[PDB]
Amino acid sequence: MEAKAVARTIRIAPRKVRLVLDLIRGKNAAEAIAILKLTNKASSPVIEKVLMSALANAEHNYDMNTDELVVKEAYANEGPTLKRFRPRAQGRASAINKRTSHITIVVSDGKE
Amino acid sequence: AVPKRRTSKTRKNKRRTHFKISVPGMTECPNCGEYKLSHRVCKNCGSY
Amino acid sequence: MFAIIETGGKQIKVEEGQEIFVEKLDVNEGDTFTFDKVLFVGGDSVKVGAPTVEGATVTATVNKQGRGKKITVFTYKRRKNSKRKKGHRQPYTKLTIDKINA
Amino acid sequence: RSAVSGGGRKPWKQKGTGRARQGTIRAPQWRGGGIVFGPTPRSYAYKMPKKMRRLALRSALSFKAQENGLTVVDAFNFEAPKTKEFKNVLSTLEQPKKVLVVTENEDVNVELSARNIPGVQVTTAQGLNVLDITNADSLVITEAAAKKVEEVLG
Amino acid sequence: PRVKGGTVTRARRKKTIKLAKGYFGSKHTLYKVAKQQVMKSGQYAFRDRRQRKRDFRKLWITRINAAARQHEMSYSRLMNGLKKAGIDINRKMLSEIAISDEKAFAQLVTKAKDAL
Amino acid sequence: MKLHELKPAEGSRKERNRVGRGVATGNGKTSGRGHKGQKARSGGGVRPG
Amino acid sequence: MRQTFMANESNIERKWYVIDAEGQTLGRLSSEVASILRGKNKVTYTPHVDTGDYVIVINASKIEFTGNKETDKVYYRHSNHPGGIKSITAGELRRTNPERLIENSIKGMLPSTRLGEKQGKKLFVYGGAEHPHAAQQPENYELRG
RNA sequence: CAAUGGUAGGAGAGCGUUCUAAGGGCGUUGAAGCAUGAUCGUAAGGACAUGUGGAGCGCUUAGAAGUGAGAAUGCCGGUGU
RNA sequence: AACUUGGGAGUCAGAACAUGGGUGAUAAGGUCCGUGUUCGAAAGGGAAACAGCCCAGACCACCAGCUAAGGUCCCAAAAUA
RNA sequence: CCGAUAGUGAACCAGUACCGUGAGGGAAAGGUGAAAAGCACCCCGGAAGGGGAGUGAAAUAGAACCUGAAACCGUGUGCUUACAAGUAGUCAGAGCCCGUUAAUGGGUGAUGGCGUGCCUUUUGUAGAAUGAACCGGCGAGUUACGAUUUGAUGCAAGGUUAA
Ligand SMILES: [Mg+2]
Ligand SMILES: [Mg+2]
Ligand SMILES: [Mg+2]
Ligand SMILES: [Mg+2]
């Protein structure tokens, strides 16, 4: 009834991916894929990938159909941040936090 | 020219109410049935 | 059928069949407490006791002698390092009226 | 703050930086710094007057003679070390799990026999100590040790 | 023997965070501000447990005053009349008598109007 | 007397006064030394006489 | 917390009342009307809910004034602009827009709380014998002097 | 029957943390921690139940202390705006 | 209550009002003394708000009662006495 | 006596990264499981990841691996909120949901009353005096010897040892 797919430590800031995941929340699988493939943002290819993984998992493990599949819920939360520095002026150094993201998507057949 | 105080979580989430991406202008393609952007050429088929 | 009694340091208006909460008394569970300080018996037959209405008593069964919920007294004075925390629990009684007199 | 490695340089200048004024990286507030007033090597022993030391041995031996825990035995006579036999003796004498056995002078075989019975300590009549009489719930004194302990402690 | 201050600071701070359950924003997740707000709350409560006694007193006054003027008589005269008559009913009990039993309130108003 | 029930002589022992631990003890902030001056400093005070 | 009645909106009944102003001084009418619509004459008064009645004032141009505040008693009002202060005397209000005169004298006698505004909205002042509120069935009310 | 605001400050009684001695106990049939809860005492605080957790830990009396943090433009580490 | 002896202190920046005086200008929320009070170290009611003014000293409840200073047409409890 | 912000600077390739021309200065960093049994195959993906199946007592024990708090970031929602002037609480209270360590119960709160954080320093601070972004850990009257005084305990014209 539910199928899971997760991408961990994706090299995109979670607040940047969340903008895109605020569109495919609760839409149908086909419409969701059409959005991702056409939204011109950076995170979009990495999330489309997760949707295909989720649908493949559903078909191959639960033998449920990929037409009545709505996106039960899809979110993204922080990951193991990488700390770097930028040489700024007058000998001072400022920090740069290269963040990451733990993308999760679950697709459901809307039943029990 | 520096923040005199913190911007609480309430104020933060409030300011970004209008900060969002719009769903693409997508319509279904007449030759293949896959979605395409309106006024653009379908990338799956290559039509109109 | 409707009367007003004076118990502890306060007054209460009562009609038989009700549960009430008053200061602690010295009677035990299940006993009967009778008040002799009645000041007004109203309703269909009104009796305006000057201090009290003479003769009218009010009898009620006693149950659940207990302690109120813990109010936590706290106070402090700023910039003085002075503060005090004390907990308190007033005792009380649950009384149920079962008869009235006139 | 004197025994922690290094820490001799004023970590930054006193004024101008916007930081708190610091003088060593080994000050007590610093991670890795000197301890203020902690443990120091010392002894803990004290002394009491001599007469008071004697009233304490007598008081412990009188508590263990009011509670009926003083069994005077005549002699001991163990001619070779054997533990199973010392357990038989203390059980036939009905002595509690914790007993203190007192010999006259050093009795090697009695000592080697009760070293492993868990709950039994063997002591000479001169080496009687309060902590030992007071832990022991029962005593077993040789008649010769009993006359020696009466002579010394009174 | 060293002793490390674990597992005591935790409980002490948590039983104030929990005691600030339901305060706006950052006042219900931080010890350093939750404690101040709880202190202030205790102070306010200690004052209000006194203020209540007088707020409800004047509530009963307003109700009795409204009730008396329906009988063409003012609160001051009403209370003076009951004092003369010897009646010792609280302001609270007059409030509920006026709300519930109009006939009885009228009757004791007359007994007070006649105690002039 | 048993080693697990012992009692010290009445009034013979007393817990010492720890200083500078909370306001409630009564010696909280200044540790009983007042506010300022030599008396309020470490190794302060004045030589006797 | 024993037994004091508290009015709530399932038991509040509000009535309508017309109070004529022909021959009644501003303050001595406005204070009484404010007491009315506050509900301080309801034996079932409650401070935290809007008990109290509706009020209509019909004439509102036959107001008289004591002393000579016909020319004095100037009302001021500011527009939050620099030097944005202009003023008007009481007589000019009484001849031009007399409804506002009474509607502003009474609302000054109520609190500024939210209940204050919702109570002041229970007032309808008209400047001439006729009122357009006959459907709410109003009852003449006399003033206790 | 009387007394009980309180700062510098004096006096007294106590609550808690680690360790030790002894006694008596609890623990894979689930310890310590952690989280939740509408529980108990005058306070410092003490329990109980349910989850996670996968091995130690309470209680009584008495001893010792690296024993209690919210501020030092404190130090270290995380994470904000 | 007071005094004596002994153990432990903190205090040596005061403030405003009223009243007797100096100084200044019968100036100052001035300054220096004397004599109260209060604040300091004092919450509560009044003075719109307002450490020092007026009234009054908070052990902890209570949806009881009486009053002081201030008050009683509305904001806002009490006299449109 | 310390149990990884402790105890050596260093429990771990440490006087090592690193810093400085050099004297010198100097870190951070332990913990899968009993056993490596360290995940055969299948599925999406270029891969990183993942989802099944299997190993194991346990895999939110999967190698960054025991427990896994708070700050902080999200996803749901029960109750609220778009005429209002708010040191954010308290006190009074309708409406709406829920039901316990069953006790005169829990969550939210229309609307009214009262109400300018905390510390330090001051005669006096809501102060626009100072101090703290926030969480966590660490972080300050101790010890040795001697003097004085009080309590306690010996025993007393005697008491007492030091090496
Ligand atoms: Mg450069
Ligand atoms: Mg400030
Ligand atoms: Mg400011
Ligand atoms: Mg600052």
Coordinates of N, CA and C (backbone and C1' of nucleotides) and ligand atoms in Angstrom, one line a residue, chain J residues 117-119 126-132, ligand 2:
Chain J
rG117 P 9.2 44.3 34.4 O5' 9.9 42.9 33.9 C5' 10.9 42.9 32.9 C4' 11.4 41.6 32.6 C3' 12.6 41.1 33.4 O3' 12.3 40.7 34.7 C1' 13.0 40.6 31.2
rC118 P 13.0 41.3 36.1 O5' 14.2 40.3 36.3 C5' 14.1 38.9 36.1 C4' 15.5 38.4 35.7 C3' 16.6 38.9 36.5 O3' 16.7 38.3 37.8 C1' 17.2 38.8 34.2
rC119 P 17.7 38.9 38.8 O5' 19.1 38.1 38.5 C5' 20.3 38.5 39.2 C4' 21.4 38.6 38.2 C3' 22.4 39.7 38.5 O3' 23.2 39.3 39.6 C1' 21.9 39.8 36.3
rA126 P 13.8 49.7 36.9 O5' 13.2 49.1 35.6 C5' 13.4 47.7 35.3 C4' 13.2 47.5 33.8 C3' 14.2 48.1 32.9 O3' 15.2 47.2 32.5 C1' 12.1 48.9 32.3
rG127 P 16.6 46.9 33.3 O5' 17.2 48.4 33.5 C5' 18.3 48.8 32.8 C4' 17.9 49.5 31.5 C3' 18.8 50.6 31.0 O3' 19.0 50.6 29.6 C1' 16.6 51.5 31.5
rA128 P 20.1 49.7 29.0 O5' 20.8 50.6 27.9 C5' 20.1 51.2 26.8 C4' 20.3 52.7 26.8 C3' 19.7 53.5 28.0 O3' 20.5 54.5 28.4 C1' 18.8 54.3 26.0
rA129 P 21.4 54.5 29.8 O5' 22.1 53.1 29.7 C5' 23.4 52.9 29.1 C4' 24.5 52.7 30.1 C3' 25.0 51.3 30.2 O3' 26.1 51.1 29.3 C1' 24.5 52.1 32.4
rU130 P 25.9 49.9 28.2 O5' 27.1 48.9 28.6 C5' 28.1 49.2 29.5 C4' 28.3 48.0 30.5 C3' 28.0 46.7 29.9 O3' 29.2 46.2 29.1 C1' 27.1 46.8 32.0
rG131 P 29.0 45.3 27.8 O5' 28.6 43.9 28.4 C5' 29.5 43.0 29.0 C4' 28.8 41.8 29.6 C3' 27.8 41.1 28.7 O3' 28.5 40.2 27.7 C1' 26.8 41.5 30.7
rA132 P 28.2 40.3 26.2 O5' 27.8 38.8 25.8 C5' 28.2 37.7 26.5 C4' 27.0 36.8 26.9 C3' 25.9 36.7 25.8 O3' 26.3 35.8 24.8 C1' 24.9 37.1 27.9
Ligands
MG2 MG 20.2 46.4 28.3

